[PDB]
Amino acid sequence: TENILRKSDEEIQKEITARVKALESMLIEQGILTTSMIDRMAEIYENEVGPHLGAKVVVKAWTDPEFKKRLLADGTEACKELGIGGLQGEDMMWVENTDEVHHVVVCTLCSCYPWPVLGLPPNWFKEPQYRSRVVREPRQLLKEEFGFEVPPSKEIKVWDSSSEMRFVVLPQRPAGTDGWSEEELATLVTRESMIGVEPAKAV
Amino acid sequence: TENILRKSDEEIQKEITARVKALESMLIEQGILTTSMIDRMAEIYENEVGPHLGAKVVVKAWTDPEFKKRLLADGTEACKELGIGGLQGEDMMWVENTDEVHHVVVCTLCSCYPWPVLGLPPNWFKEPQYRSRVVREPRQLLKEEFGFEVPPSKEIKVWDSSSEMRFVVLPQRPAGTDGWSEEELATLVTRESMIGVEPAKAV
Amino acid sequence: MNGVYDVGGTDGLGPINRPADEPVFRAEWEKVAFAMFPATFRRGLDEFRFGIEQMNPAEYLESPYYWHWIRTYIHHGVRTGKIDLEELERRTQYYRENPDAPLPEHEQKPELIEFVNQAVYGGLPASREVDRPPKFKEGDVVRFSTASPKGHARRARYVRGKTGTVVKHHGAYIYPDTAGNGLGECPEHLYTVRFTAQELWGPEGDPNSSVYYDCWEPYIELVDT
Amino acid sequence: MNGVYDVGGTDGLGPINRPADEPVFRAEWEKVAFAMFPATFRRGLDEFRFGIEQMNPAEYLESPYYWHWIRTYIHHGVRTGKIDLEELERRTQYYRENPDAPLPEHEQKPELIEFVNQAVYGGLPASREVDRPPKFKEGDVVRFSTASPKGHARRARYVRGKTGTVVKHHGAYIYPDTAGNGLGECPEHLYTVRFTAQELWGPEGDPNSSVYYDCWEPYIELVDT
Ligand SMILES: [Co+2]
Ligand SMILES: [Co+2]
């Protein structure tokens, strides 16, 4: 939004870069940061951990009703059955989209997100526009920002992660996918479908 | 406070000046602003209306107990007895400092101030630091910002002007001023003493 | 609306910046912004507030105060179509580049001066006479509404749902929840209510302090007379 | 604390800015800020949050997200004296002027890599075993405290004093009101509570919506089982 007091993006980027390199040079001299530790972290959430992991959990719960029941009883344990877990997903509770109930997830206090199944959150999730409005106008927010009309009779449940418990949406299986393979069904599970801001892809 | 995104004060001033002259040139062409109307307003609150007016009300209530009772019953009517009133002081309620009670005044929603007795408010009154903290830590705010220790047994009453009613503090008469003239006592009444952030001057 | 502008009880805004003295007007542009308050209501005061409340909050929190007045005027201008926003940008750049360029030629208007002196010394009273008598009276114990309108209102978040004691009935006044939203005056009875610090903040409140907050009749409901 | 960072239910922040795609890291500096989360707790996660919450709000609301992490690290560094603030300013200007200058020579450390892989795939669980049993159970109707600590807590203003229904007991976890204020873990039982939109916002709330908010035991008191 327009703010006449604000520097240009380019000027902001240039100032942040210098402040960060300066702090980094001090942490390195203290021995608590190294270039290799930085690259390993970047490498992990750029290539290893990401929403493709959460899609596997979704297609398994879609095609395996016993697993789905365990997913909904205890999300951390069930995702572990697929070797999926760890940092910022130590406590995971998955919640099921139905014909009667739609779920959407948010961290109004900061940016809490289930990193082991989704990776790091997109910037709109961590920013004040989504966080402030979704607990208060979920139905319009979904219509206006995501093109997603949730009928006024359907209940919208908003999960605000004020604790280390992380909420992940299990989206409804799209119609027209009977008997599809797990890899086929995965192409329909989006990051957005597991935040609850979109359904899984149609067709 | 430090904000790395913020332009320099000089750059902010230069940008505001241009935006204001631009808006002004448009309002003038619409005929709703003129240079003479601007100068008259500036002239009034630079030279005519100011806290010297409120000091007269204070010294009268100090030296006239019947007037003081009318001041506290209906502030607008009593100030009118001195030909003092008008814009942003249509409804005035004055409140009395005692040995048991100290009063402080604030507009947390914006900047409401009793213009006819005080003039326009200082910038710290209209800014978020004072407005946010005074309803919540009045005692420390008075100590830290104004050097004013209000003993923890004394009750601090904070008046938040959420309506057109304007609150004005009647400060306690300083000790050691028995029989002083009205002009002498006026030198002790400050703008700050009628906001409640300071007592009237000592000695 | 639940704007950040509603700063009562917000933590972490920092120490007060108070110079020892300052002038009424720190720059000539501030006089122009000021003169626009009286030029505005000549939309009322409530709508004028609502437009400041819809500012960019980061802009609101750090800009010079009278910039808020410039913003609220532009807000209503473009909405009522009286200010063409594109012409205004062109004029801004023009004056960016030629800051000493003259203003447009205009006739001085005597009636604008008489209006100014009239409003300043005569006032613009918001008190109104209504047909219903007051619902509440001194010493009634009342509860501030937990409603949260999306438009303009005077319901500071830090009192919503709190319980206080009615301290004074003032008569009836312009009602902000209609006036500042373009829905008319719809006058309502006005009361000062007293809230203890401990009711407002919990144990973190000063044990010997209270806050007086003005409530319009629809804001409060009886708990005990 | 009552920081502006607690944005749930705030009005007027504007439309969402969402590009169609974006990379995980938009600039190399963001990777450096990110790597500082794991370098921090090697102070816990709660204290890390508290330092972001004490930022300048206008800075907080508009800066790139990972700038918040840089701020919270500097906050704790100067406080614990581990970051000399004057050296840091000199280094900033140095890198302002020589942005391609090398970093200081250092030994790579194998144990920092093993720590990283350990934290990432093994996790850093906040669940703890406590000696007292839970006070509350599914279907209990509870009221969220109206307390307002000045330090760190997880009491979003928009639920304080609201009434909800306990939905699930999770066990006990690190308690933020002690942990994020340097007062230890002091583990407490954790519950998900359900609040209707209408309890939260009044008539302005969606008539078919509810918000689930996690509450630690001291946050809530019984109204009805
Ligand atoms: Co978060
Ligand atoms: Co005000």
Residue numbers in the entry:
A (entry chain A), B (entry chain A): 2 to 204
C (entry chain B), D (entry chain B): 1 to 42, 46 to 228
Give verbatim lines from the article.
Hence nitrile substrates should pass through a tunnel to access the active site, and rational tunnel engineering might be a plausible choice for NHase substrate scope modification.
Two successful mutants, PtNHase-βM46R and PtNHase-βA129R, which exhibited high catalytic activity toward bulky substrates were obtained. Both structures had clear electron density at the mutated sites. The βArg46 and βArg129 residues were located at the “upper entrance loop” and “lower entrance loop” of the substrate access tunnel, respectively. The hydrophobic side chain of βMet46 in WT was buried and oriented towards the interior of the protein, whereas the bulky side chain of βArg46 in PtNHase-βM46R formed a hydrogen bond with a water molecule, showing an obvious outward offset to the solvent. Introducing β46R and β129R mutations into PtNHase resulted in an 8.2-fold and 4.2-fold increase in activity toward pentanenitrile, and a 6.2-fold and 8.3-fold increase in activity toward cinnamonitrile, respectively. The residual activities of the WT and PtNHase-βM46R were 64.3% and 62.0%, respectively, indicating that the mutation at the βMet46 site did not significantly affect its thermostability. The maximum entrance sizes of WT, PtNHase-βM46R, and PtNHase-βA129R were estimated to be 39 Å2, 47 Å2, and 46 Å2, respectively.
